[PDB]
From a paper:
Eukaryotic ribosome biogenesis is a complex, tightly regulated process that involves many ribosome biogenesis factors and spans different cellular compartments. Here, we answer these questions and reveal how the nascent 60S moves from chromatin to the late-assembly compartment in the nucleolus of Schizosaccharomyces pombe (S. pombe). In vitro, Fkbp39 binds DNA and nucleosomes but dissociates to bind nascent 60S particles and to partition them from chromatin through LLPS.
Among other differences, the RNA domain III is flexible in state 1 but stably incorporated in state 2. The accumulation of state 1 particles in fkbp39Δ cells indicates that Fkbp39 is required for a step in 60S biogenesis along the transition from state 1 to state 2. In the wild-type dataset, the majority of particles (~85%) had density for Ppp1 and associated proteins (state 1B), whereas in the fkbp39Δ dataset, only ~55% of particles in state 1 exhibited density for those factors. Furthermore, in the wild-type dataset, state 1B showed the N-terminal helices of Ppp1 stably incorporated into the nascent 60S subunit, but those helices were less defined in the nascent subunit isolated from fkbp39Δ cells. These data suggest defective ITS2 processing, and in agreement, we observe the accumulation of ITS2 in Ytm1-associated particles in fkbp39D cells.
Residue numbers in the entry:
A (entry chain K): 5 to 29, 42 to 265
B (entry chain m): 213 to 258
C (entry chain o): 102 to 238
D (entry chain t): 51 to 215, 232 to 249
E (entry chain G): 69 to 120, 125 to 236
Write the structure that this text describes.
Amino acid sequence: ELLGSDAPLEKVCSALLEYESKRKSLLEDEQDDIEPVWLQLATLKFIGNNRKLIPYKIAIKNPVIPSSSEACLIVKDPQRVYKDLVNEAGLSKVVTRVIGLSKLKAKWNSYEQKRQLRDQFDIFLADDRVIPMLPRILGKTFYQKSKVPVPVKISKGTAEQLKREVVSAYGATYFNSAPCSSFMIKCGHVSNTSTELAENVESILQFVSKHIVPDGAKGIASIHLKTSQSIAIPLWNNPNLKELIASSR
Amino acid sequence: TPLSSAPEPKRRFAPSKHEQKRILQLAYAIRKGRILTSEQRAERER
Amino acid sequence: KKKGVLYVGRLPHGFYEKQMRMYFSQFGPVLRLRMSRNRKTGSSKHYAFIEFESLDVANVVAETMHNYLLYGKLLQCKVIPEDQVHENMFKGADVPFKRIPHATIARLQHEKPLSKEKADKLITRHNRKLKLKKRKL
Amino acid sequence: FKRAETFINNYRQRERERIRLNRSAKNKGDIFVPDETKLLFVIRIAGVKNMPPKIRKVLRLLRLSRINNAVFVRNNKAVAQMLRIVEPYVMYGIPNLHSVRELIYKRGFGKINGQRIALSDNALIEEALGKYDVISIEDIIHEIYNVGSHFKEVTKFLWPFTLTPRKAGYCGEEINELIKKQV
Amino acid sequence: LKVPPAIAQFQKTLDKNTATQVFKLLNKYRPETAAEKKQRLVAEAEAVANGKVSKKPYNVKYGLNHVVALIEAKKAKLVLIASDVDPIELVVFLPALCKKMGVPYAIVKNKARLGTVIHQKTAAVLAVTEVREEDKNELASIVSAVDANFSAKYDESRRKWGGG
RNA sequence: ACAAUCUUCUCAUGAGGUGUUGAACGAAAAUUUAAAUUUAGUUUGAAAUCGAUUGGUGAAAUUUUACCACUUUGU
């Protein structure tokens, strides 16, 4: 309704569940990893002035990061105070390691050391005040292997805020803005059913049209639904994209 | 492998007892006024 | 007499064409110098080839600058034999990589004005391509 | 001779300076612009080889072509922006009336006929600044302290001070203390 | 004259560049002076005299009996032998003991330079046993340099009678 | 002279924070405009032996820019 005064949802997302299921065709270590759902968006005009190395906190109701995924928290000095707060909040099983910024800069200097730290956790969360430093220190070994630290605001440093922020951080999808006209957003996996997947799509679309696309949903060229190896089924096409680009330019 | 199979003494995993001997000796003479404390060392200098 | 060529590897970030020229000229003059850079962005490949007018000057430099502890990197200097030197492998000598900013040039053409005829050409067979995708599905 | 590690260190400083100028110019075009002082003293701390072309041009405009050169400038938006660009290589502070008089009496030298000549006599000052209503060293010092209309002309006539032997950036009233250590 | 290989090896010392980089790491781990040790202990004395738990210290290991015991225990990561010990037989076995125990070792110049690190007039041998996590890469790079600039170099030269 | 200023947060409630080693392997999609940017992912020693792309733009006094990048080379 917001995008084009129409809602061609539900039917396409539900059909995609059967489309990937039909395309199904001893090991010791097993995991519940599922193929992600890639929501492709095309915009009429470029949406990024420059490479922004922070994710978008797209709040969602169906988390794309399972609660079994380990988390690593990066805080400002000293690390002992925030280590005590994490333990007192009951996040020991979630926030496994808390690394102070000075310790992260010093004790992890080699590329192999940075890669070992990167592979030791599934998601990285960072204090909002220390996020601008992580472009350095962490380097290309983090920002290209799908490991972008999350800007979690823990400024006041209290247990309830930590629990709310982590739950909010886990229950959200992220997308790193890049200068282009096309991008993909993680909407979920096959584990999430059709109705939950549809809810994730519309919530992301509202967030995208609000704080990502400068002119809103009117500037959306086309949108498609895709998986790792599935066909990019066209979710929706702008009925007036061709004339809008001609008139704008 | 290391040449010596002798067990590791506990002294290498605990705070030094030689320094603790001196700390108690220094703390004693601080009470007796034999050694000037750091705060009163500065006052005497100026 | 014979123009010796030296290969320098594991260059620390910052030991670039200007820095190598003023340094290696102390041992002996250098007239051409080239360091490999990536096609896409021109970032240094941390390895380079430096020639010398005389093979003897190249040989002595390789002796004193092999396994040099520079910035935590063991600089490697080996003299390349002539049979493995190629004629076209020293083009763009000391050439400031004209790093074309493809991101902005894409934006400029993206933001470049497009007329109705240009938009019609831009549309082309997009509907047909969408129909072809629908037919495939 | 020069070691290889020296050239990389110079390069790293050059790349370090390039980013810093990129910070100050783009998206951070705001200067502190200290108030309560119409005149400030700026001394070039140090410079390195192969310095950025923009920094050298700012130094040439500010007459800081040599290290340990002290020049008095008027507080302005353009001056503050130039000071921010050359902040790493220049230290700024608020001079005092006593410090300014002492500097003029000790190391006060003007530019007469294109040559740096000490203002040991008031006859030269009167002849050089006849149209500026300046005839003695005290009059020039008072005009500089008050930052008058002829202060810019007096500053151009006066050669830069050589306060040879410090922190980087704004120093405030502590810069006047360094003047006592130089004169 | 003609010298045996075990004494000839001490004329081939570490190069100036690698030695200068070695002492940059060593100077981070100097033992605290007699004055600094007294200041630290008296500071803890006042906290005891009035009224009131640390980490393990970090420093470079020195002493001939101490270092040889650390090599035999395989506790030493890097052993730096002085090149001019007045009785040479004091350290004439150290390169062989370091080879047997797999300890990266180097022969550096000016035993006085070694002593300056430890606030002593003279040291026959220095040994780095275990450093802070910040300097793991710096020590690792030095050990690789010592392998190439000292062990890979010479080696065939250290088995030949020198002099003559 | 292996030393130097990469943000350990601001503004205003939202908007910002411009910064990443190289090489190799490897998807399948989208718009731009095959070439181009996005783009599932991965492997690694601050690893390396031709493959430099080679356009735009300025700024000193055409050679000079080691990112000058279109917002595009000395105040």
